[PDB]
């Protein structure tokens, strides 16, 4: 069980709202920013995880059209592939973390302003937008 705090806006946390994944401050209810890292749905090797909502059990962060949303696992390999991430050292500071996609290993979870998206990471600010602190 963990929250993910943004490296560059450190009072904002990854959270779900109307099934979109985004970051926000003063997250209400606070349980929309609580997550469980579980073994990757598409790969149970060390380092691979899926990111399950604590207040919507069975629903996980999943990418589609390069956007991340909170979606119910429908049991498919397609879902699992797009909802599995490798936790790697933080791209902006390696003592934090970044989430690299399993099926698109050059893309990472990043906030784009308040939206959460799955992007290739080029600039310093892109690295900072893709870096999170695990609060657990
Ligand atoms: Ca999103």
TrEMBL record:
Record-listed Ca(2+) binding positions: 20-21, 67-68, 116
Highest taxon of the lineage: Bacteria
Ranges annotated as spanning the membrane: none
Family listed: Belongs to the glycosyl hydrolase 43 family.
Name recorded for this polypeptide: Alpha-L-arabinofuranosidase B
Lineage: Bacteria, Bacillati, Bacillota, Clostridia, Eubacteriales
């Amino acid at each position: 069980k963990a929250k993910f705090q943004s490296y560059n806006y450190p009072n904002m946390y990854i959270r779900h709202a109307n099934f979109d994944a985004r970051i926000d401050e003063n997250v209400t209810p606070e349980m929309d920013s609580q997550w469980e890292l579980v073994p990757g749905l598409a790969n149970s090797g060390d380092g691979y995880v899926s990111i399950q909502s604590v207040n919507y059990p069975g629903y996980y962060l999943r990418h589609s059209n390069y956007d991340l949303s909170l979606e119910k696992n429908d049991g498919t390999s397609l879902f699992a592939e797009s909802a599995t991430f490798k936790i790697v050292p933080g791209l902006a500071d390696p003592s934090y973390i970044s989430f690299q996609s399993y099926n698109f290993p050059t893309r990472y979870i990043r906030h784009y302003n308040y939206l959460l998206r799955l992007d290739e990471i080029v600039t310093e600010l892109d690295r900072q937008d893709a870096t999170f602190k695990i609060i657990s």
